[model samples]
Target: MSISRFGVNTENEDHLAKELEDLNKWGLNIFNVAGYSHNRPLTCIMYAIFQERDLLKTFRISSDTFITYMMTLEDHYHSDVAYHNSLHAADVAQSTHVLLSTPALDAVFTDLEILAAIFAAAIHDVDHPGVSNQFLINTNSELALMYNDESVLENHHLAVGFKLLQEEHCDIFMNLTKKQRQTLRKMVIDMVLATDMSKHMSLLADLKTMVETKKVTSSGVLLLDNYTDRIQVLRNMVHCADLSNPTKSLELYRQWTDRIMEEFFQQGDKERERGMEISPMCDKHTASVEKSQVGFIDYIVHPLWETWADLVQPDAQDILDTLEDNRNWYQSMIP
Candidate 1:
């Protein structure tokens, strides 16, 4: 019941090292990491990020232990599931890092908060079942009953992430003192739990207000004067990364859209077998993938990215442009 059978040490290749150097940039297409890293995208991406940030040194963590823990954590991700697997986690984690690296917010967040944001994104969807929370609830799943149907999947993701940290070999946070650990623990949970879709509205509203009322220092850096403001932006940053598909290149965006649609269709097939009502965008027979993505961008992705672009200004303008291009591409397919 500890680490699964697939857990093995990851082997880093030279090409992977070359690819990971792009970790500092937005154009780093994460899917390529899988093939380059020999199916260890999550571990390679995280190891690169940790090394890039010198987190192991700053936090006094053992490099051996960190990779060991990451390899095990990646194994827990359901590879059979099309969308919510290790690659997605790597993508989000890297996206969080890229967002934090924006010049507009240079030095806006502390190293510790930046660490928390990256760590939160890395584990946000750990052990996901590749099905929606409502699907879990309506089917009366064990996870639904266990958590009383409140953010069921998100709750499970947090539990698995924390529990993995409890094992001594995987306790990558052990080098820290009680206070640092407590701060990290709290911020990580807050950021990950915020990934629950139920919290999207309030999070977005707060983000919009923060952008409108934002203050900055003389150096043109964002001036978030309070912990409330700090964590709010961190939460939205991870969530934005989670919803950042259409903002990626069409090639990358199409791959994700296909994986997610396949996952949804599988869930629909299960619902039909159980004589339950299929959810929107799950009916593969009638669902229009391009049209659904257009609606998704219009309703979900664009709005949030628009707010985020406002917060980061010119730094995110190109990203917003990419989103618009992706939306138009999808729209063009919707005949």
Candidate 2:
């Protein structure tokens, strides 16, 4: 209920300032954050960013009300889920913060756009059921029926997140002008929807096209002066954050791999119990974590990051290097 309950000492300005700095610099390690708080890391990060960005002032949102809203939002995340929890949301939020700070992207987006991107990342997976869309469809689950099998989880996430804002005290967007609120809502929904794994190919295709034809200013800064171009970039930026585990250090990457595999195996267990076919990378008996990681990198992670690096120039090259090293490490572990 209170901010302090989330492992943050609301009175400790010095500690909060340091953490904010680290969030801006290296981003928060979900493992480290989870060790500190059971399931409130996302709330903590969101609170800090709201303060740092003066969002309270900009939106005329009460700090107490905002904290309560975020705490309530965090409560919706299923901690029982091995991977898609508050920690993942926090990691994505922090990753979005880092990506937006790319020097090449400096001044490319307005404050409103930045807030929407960060907010979208922070709440992108709210109320996830820990199973993939395929699992929901195979079982004829309520979510699949509700969303008509189209990005069911993602649609639920957006719906739940916005529904939380209906609470009087949590109406952070209440003060925004009609047009401002409309624009923010549209951007947030678009970015979050773009996170669906099914949209991966189309998103990456658009990203590659943008990179190939991207224009820059004489000042050597990337230029995205139009709404369409800017929103597309933000969409890909959040997608990159969502799939950034391989770009992290080996220790953190391994932690994520373990969590995801556990989640997948549980889904496999459910399928077997129902006498259905098991999904790839879900059957623990035949699944190879190392080999799967290698395949994920080769097919998904590397290509996306490569295009991202082209967009951000040398800023993201180090991330690509770490990804490559991680891929090699996984390759060596395979028989």
Candidate 3:
């Protein structure tokens, strides 16, 4: 895709315009990766996929209704961080599309399953309130109260996404027969809930067990005969996508770091206002961006990606290199 054709340019119009024009003429000669083959930009891949069939009806309804929903989410500032904003949603959506389109898993998932996985990526954090589930539960916020403080943020995200579908423009699933709607809802929920970090260990444990038991052809493609094994692969695909921040370009990685810190610092500020000690990543006054980020990578990102690299192996090596480079970039600053 040409740089100019991507909505990502809206944030950096001049540069993006130049890049797009250059790519159009020279055909992505300068892109870190190869030229995009698809007519649609990767950012729009999820939406475009769901736009097929009668799905567009529901998508249009949800898209328009979610405008306000997204605005509300953006308004919840966690700190002055630059990278954890609504843009992270866009990043995850794009990454999920790339993972889903990987040739390895493409033949296993049905169209409906693919649609649900993509849609889950697009709206997984639709109305995030800038706090983690643990923070919400500890603070006893309204959202925590509503969810009884269990998977608070995760539940809120799913509810907000479905709630938007109540609007006429957002009712993408309205055309589905009751059973199809039910099935889609179930699959989407399973995919979205899998993104919760708290659930990661258990989920990955199951996936590891499955991988050990399942037999693949000599070529390493997953060989599965049952729905249970199939769903596990889909679950891991989305999980990897959600945790893929480190695999992105350095420029993109910096953007995400900025946003997440802002969100974290904002949470710290709230704790201080409530007369509580600041949270780890929430302290704006002394959060130490470089130090905290290094910690984030060590504790949160690396382990996840290390396991993912094992699953996808050489196909993910470049991403793994980028991730290592990013970590070293921060490590050098850790005085």
Candidate 4:
């Protein structure tokens, strides 16, 4: 096959190993990784898939097909967006890998479910407009109308990601049984849709409820016997990964803050042009980044991470610690 002409991919994989050597650590800096991967989101997805428990080999997935599928899916992400792009997807995928590896939840998810979580993470923000869904709804954009102004971005991400399989030689799951493929698709759908920020309260509430009523097996694995419990746990895993920026190293966390604020500013400029009221925190000129971040951690992020760390026990203690430190650092530095 002409695919061999690209030379052995082992070299690339080795670089990935060196560059992503800290993939399992919550302290990993995703900003530096963008350079190591040379801004290629496909590389990140390949690494994530391979990192999963022999997902490719066990499923008889050809590297060529998987690469093509990820490339096509990654291409859908807009390079123009400051955030909510491929790098963010890569970070989320990496984060999901770490979350799924938590010791407390060992053996909780099936191989197929694990694969779907990583895949969903890699494709979660595809085709994002670099603006909030509320912006889309306020502007009456096509996506907002198409999704009825509910989780517009998340729905579009799943649609475009899964749509790639209908193409030539892009079916990464070609070897899986029909039932497996369908189940994987549904899991991906559930996980991605849960990324919508609007679901924060309900999702966090459910996670808190689980923590209070938590159960574990004799082997110390988190117990989720039914599809409802299993899917809920998976959903929160993706959600935790999705909202994990504040839990990163301070510099890395600042980098993400800058990117998201830039995206927000860009949207604010458009809103000003369209003569509409700019959304809260979108206006860079007057918005206080430090104060907002402090509040976000104080309100939204810490609550979720605390519960998650409790659920996973010692596994996520480091992540929870960083988030607390970062929150204090931001508030103290407020200008």
Q: List TM-scores for all candidates, in order.
A: 0.95, 0.94, 0.77, 0.93
lDDT by residue for model 2 (50-133), tens: 776677788787777788788888899999999998989989988998898898899999888988999899889999988899
The segments of candidate 4 whose C-alpha lies over 4 angstroms from its true place after superposition are 1-16
How do the residues 1-335 of candidate 4 rate in per-residue lDDT, one tens digit apiece? 21232212443544545655676777666665555455674456445546445777888988778777877787888999998888898888888988888889887888899889988998898888888898888888888899998899899999988888888999989999999999999999999999999999999999988999899887777888788988888899999998999998888889899999999999999898889898899887799999999999998999999999999887888889989999989989997
Task: Give the TM-score comparing model 2 with the true structure, all chains together.
Answer: 0.94
**Candidate no. 1 TM-score:** 0.95
Q: lDDT by residue for model 1 over 1-335, one digit each (tens)?
A: 11121122335455565776688998898887787767887887888788788888999888778878898889899999999999999999999989989988887787889888988988899999888999998878999999999889888988999899877688888888899889998999989988998999989999999999988777778988688898999999999999998898889999999999999998999889989999998898999988899999999889999999999887899999999999999999998
Model 3 — which ten-residue stretch has the worst lDDT? 25-34
Error of 1 at 18 (Å): 2.2
lDDT (C-alpha, whole model) for all candidates? 0.87, 0.86, 0.62, 0.83
Q: Between candidates 1 and 3, name the one with more favorable TM-score.
A: 1
Candidate 1: global Cα-lDDT?
Answer: 0.87
Instruction: Put down candidate 3 lDDT per residue, 178-229, tens digits, no spaces.
Output: 8877878888888888888888887788777765675666777657777677
Comparing 2 and 4 on TM-score, the stronger one: 2
Q: Candidate 1 or 4, higher TM-score?
A: 1
lDDT pick, better of 3 and 4: 4
In angstroms, give how far residue 3 of model 3 lies from its true place.
17
Give the clashing residue pairs of candidate 1, or none.
none
Model 1 stretches astray by more than 4 angstroms: 1-12
Q: Please give the TM-score that candidate 3 achieves against the real structure.
A: 0.77
Candidate 1 at 54: error in angstroms?
Answer: 0.5
